[PDB]
Design a protein around this ligand. Structure first.
Ligand SMILES: Nc1ncnc2c1ncn2[C@@H]1O[C@H](COP(=O)(O)OP(=O)(O)O)[C@@H](O)[C@H]1O
Ligand SMILES: Nc1ncnc2c1ncn2[C@@H]1O[C@H](COP(=O)(O)OP(=O)(O)O)[C@@H](O)[C@H]1O
Ligand SMILES: Nc1ncnc2c1ncn2[C@@H]1O[C@H](COP(=O)(O)OP(=O)(O)O)[C@@H](O)[C@H]1O
Ligand SMILES: [Mg+2]
Ligand SMILES: [Mg+2]
Ligand SMILES: [Mg+2]
Ligand SMILES: [Mg+2]
Lengths: 528, 538, 532, 360
């Protein structure tokens, strides 16, 4: 090229064009996939990443891992994006989505290198994706009985599957019961803010617990809080948005008096304002008082003398959960404290949980809320436990809304590879290669399972291809036996939407990455 | 890493368009230096020198570039200058135009090999058409040769003194013509030296029937004017020098030092006697001459000149008809040089100059240039080299071709007419290379300050008739003329070499799609060239 | 824990790196493969420019640091040394074998098994070529040589002019033919001299029946043309005689000094007289010739040439019938020069070539020799022409030594892909995959040809494989074996009838060398790079 | 292993790996010396010995932690070592070197570990023939592999390796035109064929042109008398030792030898002299007076064979009174596979040597 006295773009513009640019995009995607490969499946491992602040994060969750990697490659950002999208729409499959997208790209890399027009590749991807999605919706098992015991069994198995990859697999049956107990209490929108997850360092995973009620940590008590009682056996609960303390009646308020009698009247007036609020709260019958706003030392001692319980600065979310659990309403005014707005539980307590003090409202039968209390030996231990439970909870919600299950261990992947191989053998011959490549790519899930487990993925995939071509649709990897097995009978169940969205997202990422033929980086402004 | 950090690599349409643009830039540098109305350029050498010229090779030779395509174009100009000695701008412009019309086809999805095949076909047919429209010439017609040389200098600054320069070049080339042992030769490079003495007037510049050197007598008693000098040429020093071996002497006797010094003097006497045996008038040496040797030669009434360059001595040999010798004992009358008619040694300016300038049948000459300054005389020398190289090209291949772009238009028409039968996919590049030949008339018209569109249209139309292969442009009036009426006739060799170089470089630059740069030489051991064995060869 | 003073890559990391390096090297040259391949510029950090299509040349000029890439560069060099063609195809094939083999190793197929399969596939591909894909040049005559030369010259800057360049190449190889013990005809190329001279077009390149020397006469008074050339090839210098190191001149009688000085020159004179006494009109010497001696040659009417190159001298001697003499000394303790030690030639000339003269020795007896003067537009073109012509000469030499050729245009690679993908089914289960991958790798040559032609690589190679499968499963259609790519039309074509021939040794050695290189790189599973 | 320089090494040998990667830790350096000792004593097993050492130490870790003194550990290891010697000797079986199949299998196993495992069918029999030529299977108690010269030549494939029974020399032929001597009588001279030169500081003092000419004449006569005394014995191949003091072969001597039709090969190295003489049966001649026919070696052929544009080799094929010496020519396509081919062949030879002594 030539200098050209005046240049078109700003000096520093980096333009990568053509087949080399495309192959480099595919290679960057391969890197991103490798970064999460070893987390896939029951034999998957966790990753430790460290930030500039020096805080470490340990996770088996692919979305988390990729969020933490400071990926900057414009083409490799797309895998991060589709992992985020999977975590958003479904809550599981985040590693599978990245693996599938990268494997589609890897499989079409040879044809891309030999000048095959990308439009042809994206057409093939769209076709094979629609076919595989319709096939999942076709062979997905949806029990049409609406039986409750079978609908709890289904959710428990889907949750156990979603949890058989984490550091809580050795208690996953335990946690699965709780996850179901958790989502079977939420009302109809299955709000996640309605499930509380407290992390109390200290204790074992089996020491973790679910409270069908609410629980939250003690909140900056003043003097007299230890004079209060700490157990109530049928309390009525006043939930408030009220600051209970001697304060300026208003910030723009100015008192003006010209008499010492008026001075004393004003002092006593502040005191009577406060004492009137407290007396209304007391006469409502409430033996427990929670305020989203502070409760001063005067109010603390007042309630201690009346043998009531008070907690201020309660977080808004914990208050809303207390409301949905005990059955009251949050009051900014204490002037109408009817039993209609008070809440009620069978037991209130303040107990010690591993160095911390926690208030438990337990016994709420009308509870649309639950609170997980997770124990463990490290901040990141408990954080990854919470992430695992988030996967299980999202899985259980999606299953509740559509109990249409497929099998795992790569069973569904092998079935779709079979179906698409068959379909490709019936079409002209250009799309044949690309749809066969789609099929060969789908095999990355059982292959990676076998790899992470320490098997001979080749022999196992041979067994699977044969057994799926002989008749049989739910045969996949059996990890503890280093073999294959009917995973639908082994109860390796997976909501169909998981793999549906995985294929959709992976195919979209592949099509996007493959449609880009040029990358133009402008030079950074405000260089620094 | 895999390749070095300094290793860059470009590839694809970017490289192609970049090479073509570099070539087009080289062509735009010297596009205005074409024709009889060209303008001069004053280039500044890195040695503080100055070069005023309208010579394509001079310009592109004083420029330096870093793009390899531009390097290739400068090498084009060098090749054309060395081969034919003219066309150094026409070749560059034609290569630029061909690369442009190839950029047109590479923008589309045509492969460069297709363009190259079409270019090779077009070159074959250009050659055929040039040989078909050419005419012969009787090289014995001095007026014809002078007009041929005028058609080559009319474009250069010495066009003002045209009869003079033409006669100079013609006389010089005709004299330096030499046949020996059945092998014809000209060799304007080694003989026909151009010596330019700044000062005087250019109209007094002349070609001598002999040679001239910048030397004086060794002793002021020598003659500076001899009217029938017998001349001897030597490669050996007329001094007493050491031997090749370790010849250390050992003296014990008193008479031995004096006897050894007298032995030296007697050796010098013996050399000079070997010389005087042949009775020469002038003795010319490439090496030195001792003062005692001067004494002996002077006693013999011999004028001696020393420390002459080997090339000058060879020219003197060719001029006066002598054979250079290295051992005076082996001197013969067959080696003595008769043929010179006058040796003179005259003060030109403040410098003594030796002339041997009345020779009969001199096979070498000296063109004595006189003028305003060193730069002006350097330009005159370059123009004279053009003229003499053209005269030589003619004497070798006496076929003539019309100029003014007439040949370019005739060939363009012939190729356009042959392209109709093609009916393939190479007809477009073929017909582009045919219409790329018109950049010569076009450029000419531009340098006149006339209307390219109208004139080139009228000319393209004229050249479609039957007997119109000779119609072209008048570069001083901006009109159309018959070349047999104007007089601008180029040598067929010049045009053939021009077209060939242009087409071949277009081919060379179209075959390039990738550039790897920055890598090191990997060669430091005294610049390894060829030293190695092979597989037997018996 | 190790404490080694260096870096360490291990496992999939270093394997991926090796494959990346090999791929990089192969992608450098992939664009220069086949009649539609294009040339490359190379700039030497100083403005020194080199245009070339020769893969070995390109990889020699490159500045490579990775060892897995140095291996492929050395591979191209070795192919250039042992064959003279295939230097690009061998690199491409080695890199593709590495790619597919590393893909297998990622699937956790052991590298030993991949290596066994590659070795087996190489053996069987060589055998299948030698048994099914060879054509004997005897059945075809001389046009086979011209077609092989044109096939090698396609993809070079002497491509379309191959129609004529091949004739020159063929003539030259036939000219330098010599028969040895066992009566085997040998064609020792590198005895054809190739000179470069920018100027007249390529079509004006010249084949000289004889020899051409990039030298000139030593004195301008000497003749520059001689007809009945009697040639004396000398391996010593003609200068004033200097006594050797262990000899000193010590004068104690001044009356001797003159005579001693005189001999220092008279000795050399006598030698020259002896030479000239035999009739020698041309005297070539590897050493120098003082002016004193040049005068003897001038007066005799002889042509002396100094500083000639030893190899040029050996070739002129073998071709003209002369004997290179390091000394004028016989077995009788005297010093003489016999007229039998002379060579002969029908002419010796100093010819003008673009303001630069050279020497032409034309029509030598006792053997025929060959020179080629390449004529182009500048030094870059001429250098590329020299390299291309050397490739063509090597190709014709191989065709004449081993009289077997194979078709081009990916025909051999397509046939081997078919046969090896069918043959893998019998050999093990993982070695089976390795042999299938070797087969698939072989297709990178027609793939690259089609890609470079800017055509549908997939469709074309699929049609190729279809033709060759029909040929290998229908015994009445084995004549389809000769089908390969037509890159001027993008269509398969009978390449044996089209004239696209390559020496069998090219493909065979390409496969063997590519397989060995791939195995060597595919055996590395660790790397320790020590700090300098 | 890419060392401090650009020297690359692809290797499967434990001794080579360890000595090529500077380890920078006293214990690691001791392990390097251990692998060296195994390479000396046995020649193969250099990885196994290092792995055994590392494993014994990793075992000592937990013992030290248990609280055992690291002198109890050493002596108990000595105990286990003697008992293990006993066990291994008990499970061993004797072998006679006449059993060619046991040797072939030993060599094949030594090579399976290596890169040339593919070319085992070629390199194993050559590695057994080499050790069987340079010894007397009966009464032999060791093997000197210095009697087995390996000659690495870049070019061809590993399938082109050879077991030249004579000797091969990279020193080229100076006699241009004369190669492939049949019925060759070979003479190895340690004296110089050039102008006379005393061991003292000598000079030739000229004081008359007559002496000047006579000097060259007498030099020619001296050199010619030398080449005649060589030719008269029937010698047609001439190996000349390397001389750095004075010219071992003047151009005049080369001219005369060529006219006498004698192949001449100079620059022979002073370390190859015992090898060349043991191979051909020549006897080194240091004085022209003793250059007799009885000091020559009769070979059936001596040729300079081209390696397909990858150099040249001076190969002598056939030799009367053949010596307990053999040469292996190692071909290859890159210097790294060649270097590992050489090392692998050395491992096989050292296996057969480990078999000649301690026949178990
Ligand atoms: N017990 C099991 N046996 C075999 N395969 C399993 C088992 N549990 C989960 N899997 C499979 O492992 C995969 C889960 O991948 P994982 O990394 O755990 O979560 P994600 O869904 O985010 O990829 C699914 O294909 C699932 O079918
Ligand atoms: N008087 C003229 N009128 C028209 N054309 C001319 C005239 N004189 C020369 N020409 C042509 O114009 C071109 C001038 O060439 P010039 O400028 O000397 O550069 P070069 O000869 O080195 O290419 C030549 O093609 C010549 O034939
Ligand atoms: N005229 C042709 N038509 C079709 N294929 C050709 C032709 N010439 C060469 N080829 C193919 O291109 C491949 C590479 O050729 P080329 O690049 O010239 O040699 P190299 O690979 O040694 O650089 C060869 O294998 C040959 O089969
Ligand atoms: Mg999961
Ligand atoms: Mg001109
Ligand atoms: Mg080739
Ligand atoms: Mg071993």
């Amino acid at each position: 090229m030539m200098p050209t006295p005046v240049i078109l773009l700003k000096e520093g513009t980096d333009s990568s064009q053509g087949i080399p640019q495309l192959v480099s995009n595919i290679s960057a995607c391969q890197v991103i996939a490798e970064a999460v490969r070893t987390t896939l499946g029951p034999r998957g491992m966790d990753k430790l990443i460290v930030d500039g602040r020096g805080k470490a994060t340990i996770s088996n969750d692919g979305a988390t891992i990729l969020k933490l990697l400071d990926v900057v490659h414009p083409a490799a950002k797309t895998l991060v994006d589709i992992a985020k999208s999977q975590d958003a729409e479904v809550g599981d499959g985040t590693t599978s989505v990245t693996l599938l997208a990268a494997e589609f790209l890897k499989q079409v890399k040879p044809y891309v290198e030999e000048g095959l027009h990308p439009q042809i590749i994206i057409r093939a991807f769209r076709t094979a994706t629609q076919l595989a999605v319709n096939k999942i919706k076709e062979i997905a098992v949806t029990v049409k009985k609406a039986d409750k015991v079978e609908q709890r069994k289904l959710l428990e198995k889907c949750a156990m599957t979603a949890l058989s990859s984490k550091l809580i697999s050795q208690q996953k049956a335990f946690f699965a019961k709780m996850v179901v107990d958790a989502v079977m209490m939420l009302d109809d929108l299955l709000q996640l803010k309605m499930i509380g997850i407290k992390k109390v360092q200290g204790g074992a995973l089996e020491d973790s617990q679910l409270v069908a009620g609410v629980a939250f940590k003690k909140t900056f008590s003043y003097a007299g809080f230890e004079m209060q009682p700490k157990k109530y056996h049928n309390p009525k609960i006043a939930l408030l948005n009220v600051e209970l303390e001697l304060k300026a009646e208003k910030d723009n308020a100015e008192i003006r008096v010209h008499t010492v009698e008026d001075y004393q009247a004003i002092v006593d007036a502040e005191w009577n304002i406060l004492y009137d609020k407290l007396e209304k709260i007391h006469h409502s019958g409430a033996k427990v008082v929670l305020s989203k706003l502070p409760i001063g030392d005067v109010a603390t001692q007042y309630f201690a003398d009346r043998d009531m319980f008070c907690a201020g600065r309660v977080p808004e979310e914990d208050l809303k959960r207390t409301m949905m659990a005990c059955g009251g309403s949050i009051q900014t005014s204490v002037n109408a404290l009817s039993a209609d707005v008070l809440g009620r539980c069978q037991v209130f307590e303040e107990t010690q949980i591993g160095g911390e003090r926690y208030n438990f409202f337990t016994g709420c039968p009308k509870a649309k809320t639950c609170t997980f209390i997770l124990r463990g030996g490290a901040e990141q231990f408990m954080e990854e436990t919470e992430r695992s439970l988030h996967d299980a909870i999202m899985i259980v919600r999606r299953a509740i809304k559509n109990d249409s299950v497929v099998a795992g261990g790569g069973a569904i992947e092998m079935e779709l590879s079979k179906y698409l191989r068959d379909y490709s053998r019936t079409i002209p011959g250009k799309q044949q290669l690309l749809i066969g490549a789609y099929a060969k790519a789908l095999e990355i899930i059982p292959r990676q399972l076998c790899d992470n487990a320490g098997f001979d993925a080749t022999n196992i995939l041979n067994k699977l291809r044969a057994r799926h071509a002989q008749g049989g649709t739910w045969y996949g990897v059996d990890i503890n036996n280093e073999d294959i097995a009917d995973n639908f009978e082994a109860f390796v169940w997976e909501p169909a939407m998981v793999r549906i969205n995985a294929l959709t997202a992976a195919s979209e990422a592949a099509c996007l990455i493959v449609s880009v033929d040029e990358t133009i980086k402008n030079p950074r402004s405000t260089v620094d | 890493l895999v390749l070095s950090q300094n290793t860059k690599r470009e590839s694809g349409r970017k490289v192609q368009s970049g090479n073509i643009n570099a070539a087009k830039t080289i062509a735009d540098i010297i596009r205005t230096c074409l024709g009889p109305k060209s303008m001069m350029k004053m280039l500044l050498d890195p040695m503080g020198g100055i070069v005023m010229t309208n010579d394509g090779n001079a310009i592109l030779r004083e420029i330096q570039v870093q793009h390899p395509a531009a390097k290739s174009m400068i090498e084009i100009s060098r090749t054309q200058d060395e081969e034919v000695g003219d066309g150094t701008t026409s070749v560059i412009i034609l290569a630029g135009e061909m690369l442009s019309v190839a950029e047109h086809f590479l923008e589309q999805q045509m492969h460069p090999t297709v363009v190259i095949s079409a270019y090779r076909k077009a070159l074959d047919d250009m050659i055929s058409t040039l040989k078909k429209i050419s005419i012969p010439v009787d090289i014995s017609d001095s007026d014809m040769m002078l007009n041929i040389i005028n058609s080559s200098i009319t474009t250069k600054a010495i066009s003002r003194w045209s009869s003079l320069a033409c006669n100079i070049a013609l006389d010089a080339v005709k004299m330096v013509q030499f046949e020996e042992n059945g092998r014809k030769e000209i060799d304007i490079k080694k003989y026909a030296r151009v010596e330019k003495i700044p000062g005087g007037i250019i109209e007094d510049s002349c070609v001598l029937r002999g040679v001239m050197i910048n030397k004086d007598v060794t002793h002021p008693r020598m003659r500076r004017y001899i009217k029938n000098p017998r001349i001897v040429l030597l490669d050996s020093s007329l001094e007493y020098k050491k031997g090749e071996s370790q010849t250390d002497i050992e003296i014990t006797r008193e008479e031995d030092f004096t006897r050894i010094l007298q032995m030296e003097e007697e050796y010098i006497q013996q050399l000079c006697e070997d010389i005087i045996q042949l009775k020469p008038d002038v003795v010319i040496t490439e090496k030195g001459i001792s003062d005692l040797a001067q004494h002996y030669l002077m006693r013999a009434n011999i004028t001696a000149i020393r420390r002459v360059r080997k090339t000058d001595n060879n020219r003197i040999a060719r001029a006066c008809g002598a054979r250079i010798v290295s051992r005076p004992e082996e001197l013969r009358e067959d080696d003595v040089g008769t043929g010179a008619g006058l040796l003179e040694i005259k003060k030109i300016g403040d410098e003594y100059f030796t002339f041997i300038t009345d020779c009969k049948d001199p096979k070498a000459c000296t063109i004595l240039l006189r003028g305003a300054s060193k730069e002006i005389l350097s330009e005159v020398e370059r123009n004279l080299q053009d003229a003499m190289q053209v005269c030589r090209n003619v004497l070798l291949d006496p076929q003539l071709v019309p100029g003014g772009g007439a040949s370019e238009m005739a060939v363009a028409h012939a190729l356009t007419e042959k392209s109709k039968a093609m009916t393939g996919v190479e007809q477009w590049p073929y017909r582009a290379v045919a219409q790329a030949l018109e950049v010569i008339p076009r450029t000419l018209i531009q340098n006149c300050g006339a209307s390219t569109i109208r004139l080139l249209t009228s000319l393209r139309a004229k050249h479609t008739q039957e007997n119109c292969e000779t119609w072209g442009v008048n570069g001083e009036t901006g009109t159309l003329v018959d070349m047999k009426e104007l007089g601008i006739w180029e040598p067929l060799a010049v045009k053939l070499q021009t077209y060939k170089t242009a087409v071949e470089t277009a081919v060379l630059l179209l075959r390039i799609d990738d550039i790897v740069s920055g890598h090191k030489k990997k060669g430091d051991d005294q610049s390894r060239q060829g030293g190695a064995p092979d597989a037997g060869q018996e | 824990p190790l404490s080694v003073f260096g870096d360490r890559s291990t496992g999939e990391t270093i394997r991926s790196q090796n494959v990346m390096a090999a791929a990089s090297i192969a992608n450098i040259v992939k664009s220069s493969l086949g009649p539609v391949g294009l040339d490359k510029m190379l700039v030497d950090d100083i403005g020194d420019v080199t245009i070339t299509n020769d893969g070995a040349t390109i990889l020699k000029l490159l500045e490579v640091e990775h060892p897995a890439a140095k291996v492929l560069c050395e591979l191209a060099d070795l192919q250039d040394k042992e064959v003279g063609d295939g230097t690009t195809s061998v690199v491409i094939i080695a890199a593709e074998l590495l790619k597919n083999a590393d893909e297998l190793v990622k699937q956790k197929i052991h590298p030993t098994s991949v290596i066994s399969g590659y070795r087996l596939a190489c053996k069987e591909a060589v055998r299948y070529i030698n048994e099914n894909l060879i054509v004997n040049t005897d059945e075809l005559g001389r046009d086979c040589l011209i077609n092989a030369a044109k096939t090698s010259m396609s993809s070079k800057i002497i491509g379309i002019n191959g129609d004529f360049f091949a004739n020159m190449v063929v003539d030259a190889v036939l000219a330098i033919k010599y028969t040895d013990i066992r009566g085997q005809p040998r064609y020792p190329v590198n005895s054809v001299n190739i000179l470069k001279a920018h100027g007249r077009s390529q079509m004006e390149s010249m084949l000289i029946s004889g020899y051409a020397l990039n030298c000139v006469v030593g004195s301008q008074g000497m003749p520059k043309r001689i007809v009945n050339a009697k040639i004396a090839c000398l391996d010593f210098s003609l200068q004033k005689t200097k006594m050797k190191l262990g000899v000193q001149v010590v004068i104690t009688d001044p009356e001797k000094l003159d005579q001693i000085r005189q001999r220092e020159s008279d000795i050399t004179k006598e030698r020259i007289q002896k030479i000239l006494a035999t009739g020698a009109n041309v005297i070539l010497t590897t050493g120098g010739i003082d002016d004193m001696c040049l005068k003897y040659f001038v007066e005799a009417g002889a042509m002396a040439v100094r500083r000639v190159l030893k190899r040029d001298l050996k070739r002129i001697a073998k071709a003209s019938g002369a004997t290179i003499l390091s000394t004028l000394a016989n077995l009788e303790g005297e010093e003489t020069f016999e007229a039998a030690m002379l060579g002969q030639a029908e002419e010796v000339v100093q010819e003008r070539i673009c303001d630069d003269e050279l020497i032409l020795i034309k029509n030598t007896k006792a053997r025929t020799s060959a020179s080629i003067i390449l004529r182009g537009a500048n030094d870059f073109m001429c250098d590329e022409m020299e390299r291309s012509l050397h490739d063509a000469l090597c190709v014709v030499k191989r065709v004449l030594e081993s009289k077997s050729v194979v078709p081009g245009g990916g025909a051999v690679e397509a046939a081997l892909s078919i046969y090896l993908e069918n043959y893998a089914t019998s050999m093990g289960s993982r070695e089976q995959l390795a042999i299938a991958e070797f087969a698939r790798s072989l297709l990178v040559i027609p793939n690259t040809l089609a890609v470079n032609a800017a055509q549908d690589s997939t469709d074309l190679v699929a049609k190729l494989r279809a033709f060759h499968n029909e040929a290998q499963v229908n015994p009445e259609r084995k004549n389809l074996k000769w089908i390969g790519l037509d890159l001027s039309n993008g269509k398969p074509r009978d390449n044996k009838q089209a004239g696209v021939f390559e020496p069998t040794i090219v493909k065979v050695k390409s496969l063997k060398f590519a397989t060995e290189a791939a195995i060597t790189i595919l055996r590395i599973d660790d790397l320790i790079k020590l700090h300098p | 292993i890419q060392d401090g320089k650009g020297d690359v090494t692809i290797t499967n040998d434990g001794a080579t790996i360890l000595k090529q990667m500077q380890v920078l830790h006293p214990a690691a350096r001791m392990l390097v010396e251990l692998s060296k000792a195994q390479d000396i004593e046995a020649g193969d097993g250099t990885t196994s010995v290092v792995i055994i050492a590392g494993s014994l130490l990793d075992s000592c870790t937990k013992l030290l932690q248990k609280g055992i003194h690291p002198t109890i550990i050493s002596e108990s290891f000595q105990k286990a070592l003697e008992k293990g010697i006993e066990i291994l000797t008990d499970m061993s079986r004797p072998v006679e070197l006449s059993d060619r199949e046991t040797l072939l299998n030993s060599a094949t196993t030594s090579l399976n570990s290596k890169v040339v495992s593919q070319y085992s069918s070629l390199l194993s029999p050559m590695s057994v023939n080499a050790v069987m030529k340079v010894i007397d299977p009966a009464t032999a108690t060791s093997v000197d592999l210095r009697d087995i010269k390996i000659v690495k030549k870049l070019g061809g494939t590993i399938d082109d390796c050879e077991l030249v029974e004579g000797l091969v020399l990279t020193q080229k032929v100076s006699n241009s035109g004369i190669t492939r001597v049949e019925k060759a009588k070979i003479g190895l001279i340690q004296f110089c064929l050039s102008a006379p030169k005393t061991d003292m500081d000598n000079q030739i003092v000229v004081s008359d042109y007559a002496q000047m000419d006579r000097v060259l004449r007498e030099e020619r006569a001296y050199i010619l008398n030398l080449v005649k005394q060589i030719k008269k014995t029937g010698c047609n191949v001439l190996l000349i030792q390397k001389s750095i003091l004075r010219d071992a072969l003047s151009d005049l001597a080369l001219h005369f030898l060529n006219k006498m039709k004698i192949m001449v090969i100079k620059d022979i190295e002073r370390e190859d002299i015992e090898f060349i003489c043991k191979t051909i049966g020549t006897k080194p001649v240091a004085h022209i007076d003793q250059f007799t026919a009885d000091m020559l070696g009769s070979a059936e052929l001596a040729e300079e064979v081209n390696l397909n544009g990858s150099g040249k080799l001076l190969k002598i094929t056939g030799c009367a009174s053949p010596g307990k010496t053999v040469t292996i020519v190692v071909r290859g396509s890159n210097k790294l596979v060649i270097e590992e081919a050489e090392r692998s062949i050395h491992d096989a030879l050292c296996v057969i040597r480990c078999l000649v002594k301690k026949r178990a």
